Design a binder for this molecule. Sequence first.
Ligand SMILES: [Zn+2]
Ligand SMILES: [Zn+2]
Ligand SMILES: [Zn+2]
Lengths: 57, 100
Amino acid sequence: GSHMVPEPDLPHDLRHLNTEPMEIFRNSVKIEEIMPNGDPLLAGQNTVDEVYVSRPS
Amino acid sequence: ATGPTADPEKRKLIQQQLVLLLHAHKCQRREQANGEVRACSLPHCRTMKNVLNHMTHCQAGKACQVAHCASSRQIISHWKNCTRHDCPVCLPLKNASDKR
Ligand SMILES: [Zn+2]
Ligand SMILES: [Zn+2]
Ligand SMILES: [Zn+2]
């Protein structure tokens, strides 16, 4: 907070993801410009579906 | 603010893969609607499209040989449910989808 805000608590369910494969993406994305600027809560169905992830049950 | 509980470097890596999949999910639909058109430009659009098409049929899940498959399956499920306005990972996406 003395010059820039501190890094918030990383969600524990995402800490489990091994990030070594992701190192190829480290300078290859625009987090803020990819999105269709609609709504965040709309992510429940706009993102992907059960057939897309091979839902087991 | 720098330990494994927050890790600025890692925090950006899960965000970047998450958003790349979100782009590629609809971009795969856009591309198939015109067969295989080269109209895109995302550095890993092809990388994600290969992982996504695989994920749509993969049944090995937690034991799969594709490093991005099981990771992507878990990464999508976070953004699908999170609503916290100060989540370190979702904040740039929650901003990318804001009315401002
Ligand atoms: Zn694309
Ligand atoms: Zn797989
Ligand atoms: Zn979140």
